[PDB]
Paper text:
Rotavirus, a non-turreted member of the Reoviridae, has a triple-layered capsid that is assembled stepwise in two separate compartments in the infected cell: the virus-induced viroplasm and the endoplasmic reticulum (ER). The icosahedral inner layer of the virus, composed of 120 copies of VP2, is in direct contact with the dsRNA genome and encloses 11 copies of the viral polymerase VP1 and a similar but undetermined number of copies of the capping enzyme VP3.2 The intermediate layer consists of 260 homotrimers of VP6 arranged in a T = 13 lattice on the surface of the inner layer. The outermost protein layer consists of 260 trimers of the glycosylated protein VP7, with the inter-subunit interfaces stabilized by Ca2+ ions 2,3 and 60 trimers of VP4 forming spikes which mediate virus attachment and entry. VP4 is a homotrimer of three chains (A–C) associated in an unusual asymmetric arrangement in the infection competent TLP form.
To determine whether the absence of trypsin during the propagation of rotavirus is sufficient to retain the ordered prone head domain, a separate single particle (i.e., not tomographic) analysis was performed on gradient purified TLPs propagated at MOI = 5 without trypsin. Further rounds of focused unaligned classification were performed to enrich for particles with the additional density adjacent to the trunk domain of VP4 resulting in a final class consisting of 30,964 sub-particles which represents 25% of all spike-containing sub-particles. Further 3D refinement followed by masking and sharpening yielded a map at 2.7 Å, which enabled an unambiguous rigid body fitting and refinement of the head domain into the density in the prone chain. This density was higher resolution, but otherwise indistinguishable from that seen on the in situ TLPs. Compared with the upright conformation, the prone head domain is rotated by 117° around y axis slightly offset from the trunk and displaced by 37 Å. Notably, the map enabled modeling of C-terminal residues 222–245 within the trypsin cleavage region of VP4-C head domain. The loop is stabilized by a beta hairpin from the VP4-C trunk domain (residues 414–420), which is folded back compared with its orientation in the two upright monomers (inset). In this alternate conformation, the two domains share an interaction surface of 844 Å2, stabilized via charge complementation as well as hydrophobic interactions centered around residues 298, 318, and 320 on the trunk domain and residues 227 and 234 on the head domain. Taken together, these results reveal the configuration of the VP4-C head domain prior to trypsin cleavage and show that its interaction with the corresponding trunk domain occurs through an alternative set of contacts to those occurring in the A and B chains, displacing the domain to one side, away from the tips of the VP4-C trunk domain.
Numbering used by the authors:
A (entry chain C): 583 to 593, 606 to 776
B (entry chain o): 134 to 397
C (entry chain n): 1 to 397
D (entry chain m): 134 to 265
E (entry chain O): 51 to 66, 78 to 326
F (entry chain N): 51 to 63, 77 to 326
Amino acid sequence: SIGSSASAWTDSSVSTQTSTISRRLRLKEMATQTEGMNFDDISAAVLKTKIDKSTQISPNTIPDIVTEASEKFIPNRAYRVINNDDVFEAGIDGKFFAYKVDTFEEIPFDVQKFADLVTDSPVISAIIDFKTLKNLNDNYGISRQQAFNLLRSDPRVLREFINQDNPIIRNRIEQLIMQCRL
Amino acid sequence: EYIENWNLQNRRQRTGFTFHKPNIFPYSASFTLNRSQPAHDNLMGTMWLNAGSEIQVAGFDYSCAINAPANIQQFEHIVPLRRVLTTATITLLPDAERFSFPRVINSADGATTWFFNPVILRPNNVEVEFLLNGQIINTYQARFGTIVARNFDTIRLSFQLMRPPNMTPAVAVLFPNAQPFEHHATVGLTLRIESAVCESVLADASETLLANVTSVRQEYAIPVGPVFPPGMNWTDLITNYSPSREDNLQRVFTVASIRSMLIK
Amino acid sequence: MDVLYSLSKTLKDARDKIVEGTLYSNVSDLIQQFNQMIITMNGNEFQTGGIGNLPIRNWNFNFGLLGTTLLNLDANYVETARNTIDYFVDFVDNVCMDEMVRESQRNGIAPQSDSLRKLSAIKFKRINFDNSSEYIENWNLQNRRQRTGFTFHKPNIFPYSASFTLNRSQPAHDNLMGTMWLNAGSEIQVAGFDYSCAINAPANIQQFEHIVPLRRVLTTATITLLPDAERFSFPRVINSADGATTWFFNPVILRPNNVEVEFLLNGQIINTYQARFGTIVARNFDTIRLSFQLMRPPNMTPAVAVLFPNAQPFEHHATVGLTLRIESAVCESVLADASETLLANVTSVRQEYAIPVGPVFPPGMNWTDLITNYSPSREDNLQRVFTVASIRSMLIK
Amino acid sequence: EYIENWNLQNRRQRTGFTFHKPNIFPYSASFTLNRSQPAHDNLMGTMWLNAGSEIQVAGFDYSCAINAPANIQQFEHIVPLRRVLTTATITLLPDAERFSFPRVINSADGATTWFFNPVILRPNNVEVEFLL
Amino acid sequence: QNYGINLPITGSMDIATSTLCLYYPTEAATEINDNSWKDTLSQLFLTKGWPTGSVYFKEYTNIASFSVDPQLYCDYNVVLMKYDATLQLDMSELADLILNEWLCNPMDITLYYYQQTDEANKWISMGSSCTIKVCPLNTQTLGIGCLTTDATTFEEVATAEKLVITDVVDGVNHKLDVTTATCTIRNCKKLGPRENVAVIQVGGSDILDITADPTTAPQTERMMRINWKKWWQVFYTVVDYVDQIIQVMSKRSRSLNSAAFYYRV
Amino acid sequence: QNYGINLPITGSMLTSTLCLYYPTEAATEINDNSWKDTLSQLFLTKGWPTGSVYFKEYTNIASFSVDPQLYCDYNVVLMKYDATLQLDMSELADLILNEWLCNPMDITLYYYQQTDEANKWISMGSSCTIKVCPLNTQTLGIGCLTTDATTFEEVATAEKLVITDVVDGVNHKLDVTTATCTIRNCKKLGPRENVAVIQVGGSDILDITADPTTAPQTERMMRINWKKWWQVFYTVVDYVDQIIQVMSKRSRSLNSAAFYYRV
Ligand SMILES: [Ca+2]
Ligand SMILES: [Ca+2]
Ligand SMILES: [Ca+2]
Ligand SMILES: [Ca+2]
Ligand SMILES: [Ca+2]
Ligand SMILES: [Ca+2]
Ligand SMILES: [Zn+2]
C-alpha cells in the first residue's frame, strides 16, 4: 500500500515506486480515465499515418504492426495529477516532480499524496513534460490560460504553439513522435 | 542558547550547539559484497547500519580468510557527515550486536535471498580515524571505550579478520578449507557519539524542537512547502541538508524554543 | 578561580543583556559590575601561553568605563561595549586554555597558569559577582571542605574492560564453566556460562558472581537492570587466557535464576534487590555484586533435551546473563558523562596545541587509564581543569 | 520547572514536564502463543520486552508461513501508556536484538521448557500507529 | 557491461524457460517396461509447470560407464545414481566430478614430472582402463621407494578404473606410469561447487565423500537420497518434488554472461 | 601443591610423535618392503622430522581390541569397515577415544553393580563370555539361579573386547571365562583427544555412547572411501595437518594403555 488506501492502482525508493505506479497508470488511458490528449492518441495517429504511407505492408503484416505499435510506441510516458494548485508528475523512467501551477517552482515530491490522488482523480498525459514547461516559461511569457491549458494537455494550445513555431514545444513533440518505434 | 547563537551568527562570530546523541547520521542499513556468487554460498563484504548517533559495521568472510594474503581480510567503512562536529565524545566498542545473529537477507537486486550465519571473532588491527577535509585529525588504533574527536567531518573505520593461527578442535571444525561454509567469520565495530558540538542545528535525543515543529505542522495540516521534505522527515532533511534548509531549520528551531519558553 | 569565573560570568551577562534598545534599568547593576571589573583590571598586564604550541600572548588593559546616561541603549553603546567585551573574552579564553593545558603532581587544586596565579591576588577579589554554576559552586564547597556533588547522566565510571574468567577448563576448551563481562562507561553486561548445563553440579545449579568495585562512591543512582546480556548471546571464537589458542563459545540463553544485585558501601549491604528487574534505586554504594544461577530446567521438551545431553559432546552451552545500566547518579568527585563536554574540551585543547604528556594525567587524557588510577592528585587536577573548562565554555561556543 | 508546573496545576492551567527517555512503560517481558502444542516444536506467536522507554517486540513462526495464506503471517503488539505523551521524538529500528539468539523459555504454565532458535528476516508492511 | 573485473555490489537491507536433464540407469527403463514412459513423465512435468519439450531424459548403462567423461548440458541436471555397497568410492568420485567445477590442464607423463601445488589440486583420469602408478622423487629427482626406470616398483593407486581422482602428497615431484593408450589423465583444480547438477541416490546409507580432506565429509543440499522398490515410484517422487529439487539446485555460475573472462564454459 | 587448579584463570577478549595403526592387509596389498621409509620421507616433506613417525600393525580389529596400546603423542588408527563387526568397531572406538578409569572385579567372590550411567564393565582377553544374573534385594536371582550358571543370561560370547552395560542400582552375579578374559569395572572420565580413528569404508556407524538417544560424531572420527591402501596412506600423509589440528596432544598419558588402573 504505497498510498493511504490500498488500491490495485498503487501497488531510489521514490523513483522505483513512482516508476511502477506510472507503468500501471499507462492503463488509465485504456480505461478512459484521463483528460486531454493521450500518448496513445499520438501513437494511434502516427500508426495510421505510417500505415497509409507505407508501400511494404501486407494484410498479413498489419495485425503484427498494429499490436507492436500499441505495445511499444512511446515507451517513456509521464502522467500528472493536479490537486488545488499542486502538480505531481511521474514518469515510467523514475523521474518524479512536484511543483506549483502558478510559478512552476519545484516542491519536495510527496509519494503518498501522489498515490492517493492518482488512485481516482483524473491523470493527464504529460505531452509537455515539466522540464519543457519550465523551459518554455523561462524563455517565453506563458499566460495563465496558456499554462492552464498546457498542463491540462489542451490540443488547441498545443497546436497553437506548434503553429507559432515554438522551438521548445516543437522539439518536445518531435521527440514524442520519434519515440514511436518498432 | 538558541537566541545566543542567533545573535552570534548575526555578528558573524562562531556559533555552537551542544547535542546529546546528535542525530547526524541519516538512517542507512546496507551491505556491500566485495566477493559474490549467484548462490551466495561464499561471500566477503561489509554490512552496516548508520542511524542517529550510532554506527554499527561488520565485515564478514565466509572462507575466514583461508586463502587471503597473510590469512587477513581487510574491511573499511567510510561515513561522511553532513556537518562538521567538534569536541565529540564517542564510545567505540569492538562488537556489532546487530549483525551477530542468523539472518536471511535479500540480495542486492532483490531477486533472491541469502543466508548469513555469523561466528564472531575479535576485530583485528582496529583503526578509527576522524578526518577533516581528508586530513586525519584524530586516530585511535586498537583502543576502545571513551575517545575524543576534537574536529572532523568523516569517520574511517578500518578493521581486519585474521584467521586464528592456533585453533582448538572445535574452532578447527568450525572453519574448513573446503567450500561448504556453515559458519561465517564476522568482525565488527560499534561507534556511538554520546555528545558533540556543531555549528549548525541538529536534532538530538534530549531536545524537543524538531518534535515541536513537526507536531505543529501536522496538527494544522500545513501543506508541503518548498524547503522541508514531506512531514519534516528528519532522514531526508539530514540527507539533503542544504544551506537553505539549514537556514529555515534554525529559524523554526529558534521560534520553537521561544514558544516553549511560554507553552508547556 | 572564582575571579576567572566572575570575569566569564560578567562577560556572558554583558553579551546577553547589553543589546540595542534595551532599558538602562535592565543593565544598571550589570554595568556597575562591569565597571568594577574594568577598574580592577586596568593597569595590569598578563601573559598567556608558552606551553607546547599554545602561542604566547601579552594582554594589556586600558578601557574607559561604560556610560551610565542613556535611557535606552543605542548602537553606539553596544558597539563600545562589544569592542571591550571581545577583548576581555579573548583574554578569558586564553587564560582558560593555559590553565587547562597544565597539571601539577603537588598542589593540583591550586592555580597553575601565571595569569590565574595573578588573578588569585587579593586586589582582584572585588571581581567576584556570583557563583551560580554547578561546577563553581562545587569548587567553592570543596575549598570549604563541605560536601559536594555532581549530577551525571550515564556516568563514565567503569573503565573499559572486556574479559572472561574460567573456573573449569581443559586444554581443549570443550567443557568450560565461567563468566564473561563487559564494563564500559555506565554499562555492565555479565554472562555466566556452563557447557555441561549443570548436569553434575550440586542441586543442578551453577553459581556465578561478578563483583565490580567503583573508584568513587555514587549516590542516589537510578539503575536499569535487565535479565539478559545481549552481548554474550551469539557464537564466538575467543583467544584463550594466554593467547596460545582459541576456543568456541556457542551459547543458548536461559533465564538467570536467583538473581541478587547488592549495592555495598564499604562492605555493608546498603541496597539489595532479589529477582527485581527494571528501574531500581541505589542510594549510596561503592561496589556492585551481581549473583545469578544457572538452573538446569527440571522439565524439558524433546528439543531442549536434545540440546542438553549428559555426555561430553556439548554442542550448545547454557548461558545466563545480567545487564546493569546506570542512568543517572551523583558523585562527590568529577567524572565524565554522556551529556557534558568537559572531558572533550580538555582533551581537544591539549591535542590541538600538542601539549606534551605531563606527570599527572595519562597520555591523551585516556579516560580508561584515568578512572582506573583515579588518584587523589589526579582528582584535584581533573576538577581544576574541568572547572576552568566549564568557565571557558560559558563564553566560547 | 517543577514549581512552575505546581503553580500552573494549582491554577488548573497547562502542565508540562520534558523527559529524556521517560519511564512510561512498566517492565513486562512476556510471550504470546497463537499456535502451539505440548511439544513446542511448531509455534507461532510474539515475544516482547517493554521496559523504561523501549519496546522490543519480535513475532516468530516456526513453519515460516509455509501454509499461511499468501505466505504472510501477521503480528500485532499494542502498548497502552498510562499517560498521554506529546511531542515525542521516537526511534524505530527494524530488528529486535533481544530475541535474535537461541534460548530456552519456560512454558506459559511453567510445566516444561521449549527451545527457540531464531533466524531473523526483514519485517515487511511495518506500521506504527500512535493513537489517542 | 564491464566484463572481467570485480566491482563491489551495494545493496539495501530496507528494500524488499529452463531445461531439465534427468539421468537414469538402464535398469530403470527395463523395470518400467513401457515405451511411452518418457512421454508420460513429460506430460506429468507439464502439469508441474515444465513446458513440453523442456525435459530431456538421459540413460546410462552403469555408473562405471557414466563416469567416462560425463557431460551434463542443461540448465538443471538431476542424476539418479544407484547405490552399491561395492562401489562407494566410484560413486563418491563420480559425485565429486559432477557436483564440483574442475579447471583441468593437460598432463604429459612421458615428458614432465608432476606435483600437486595445493589441497585443491588433484589428478583426474578418465577412460576405458586407467591404471595409475606413481613414483615420488626426492630433491635429487631419484625415486623414493621406486626405481625411476623400472615401472614395476611404482606404487599402483588405481587399476582398470573408468574414473579416478588421485591425491598424492603435495610439493613432491612424481613420475607417472599411466596407460595413456586407453586413459587420459589431467591436472585438475577444484574451483568451487557446480550448482547446475544434483544427485539423488537411490538406496544406501549416505556414503558420499566429495572432499579429499578426511576430516570433512560434507553433505551438501544437492546430494539427496531415497529408499526405493519401484522405479515408477522413484520417478513419481522426482516429478512431484521437482520444485524442491530445482530450489535446491541453482543456475550454473560459470555459464552466465557475468562469467565471461572468468573461466566461462 | 596442585598445578594451580582451584584458582580462577582470567583472560582478555615436530617434537611430537605420530603413531599410525593399520591392519596387516594394508601392508599385504602394498607389498613394498620400503613403504614405511617412503611414508616417513613424505611425512618429512609435510614437516615431521625423521624419527618421529612410527607405524604399528594389528592383524584384525578383534585382535587389536585385546588391550590396545597408545604410544605416540598423536595416534591415528585405521580400521577397515566390516558390516558384521559394527559393535566391535564401536567398542574399540569408544575404548580408545574416551578415557577410562578401571578397577579389578573378582567376580568369583563378590556381586557387582554399576553406580551410574558413566560406569561400565570392560572385558578384554583371548575369549570372553559374560553371563550375568541380576539379584533382588534379598540377593536371590531374578530369572536365574545363583548356584546354576546355565540359567544366567548371555551378554557376550567369545568376544575379545566387551563393554557390558547392565541396569544401574541392581547387583549382578557374574560368570566369565577368567582364564582367557579379564573383567574390569571402568568409568568413562571423558574424551581422549590424542587418538583419532579414520574408518575405511562403511557408512558412519560408530556409536561411542552407550545411551541409545545419542550417537555423537566427534571431530576425531573420520571416514574415507577407498580402493587402494596406497591412496589411503597418501591421503593421510597429505592431510596430516588437518588430522593433527583436529586432536590435542596434551591428553597423552604416561603409560601406553587405554585406561587408568585404580589411579
Ligand atoms: Ca573410480
Ligand atoms: Ca616401490
Ligand atoms: Ca595432494
Ligand atoms: Ca566386542
Ligand atoms: Ca535365565
Ligand atoms: Ca549401567
Ligand atoms: Zn541519554
